[PDB]
Amino acid sequence: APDWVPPEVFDLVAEDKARCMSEHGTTQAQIDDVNKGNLVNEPSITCYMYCLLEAFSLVDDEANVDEDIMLGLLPDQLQERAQSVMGKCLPTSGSDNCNKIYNLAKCVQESAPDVWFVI
């Protein structure tokens, strides 16, 4: 992940990472690819992102981001940049929940590739 990610997040997500990878057939290799800017629209990775976001209430049942909860989780250092990115990329839109998260990731990647990551 990017160097700014708080160490605690790696432990906080561990339980849901395992569950979500199992549920969606996700490989660590796919995850490693999102982080190197190589995102593809395949449910095994896009629904995995949805799954992990939902675990932390970062999105609701229609894959709309909760900006407050997202800003809460992000370090103080990223507040300004993240708020700008959210302004540009939200609300989410797409045919289903996984597509909404794919579309969101692509939007964030355009301006701010280091703000999005997959764990």
Next chain:
Amino acid sequence: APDWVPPEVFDLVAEDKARCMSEHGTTQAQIDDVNKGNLVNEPSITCYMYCLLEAFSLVDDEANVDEDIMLGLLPDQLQERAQSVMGKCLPTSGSDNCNKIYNLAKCVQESAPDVWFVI
């Protein structure tokens, strides 16, 4: 219903929607509620879902689901997502036909909000 639902289904279901709502005392408000994630175990809605499924030959007289045709009628991306969810949530179980379909809908909505919809 979700944005991914094929346009054709709204016309294809119309005849059976009328018949099934009439048979079960269903109101549109109840159908709207399911699509908002507010599924309640009332036979006027749970038996309605059974009735629509039966109309498409997706259930038999004991609310056994035809997994292969149900999956086959879904768009490609939903079909992929649904393979794992239906793997988990099928076969149906419950005290009667309407409870079996309630339990199925609840199971699907827990993993995959945006997959179980009603018209």
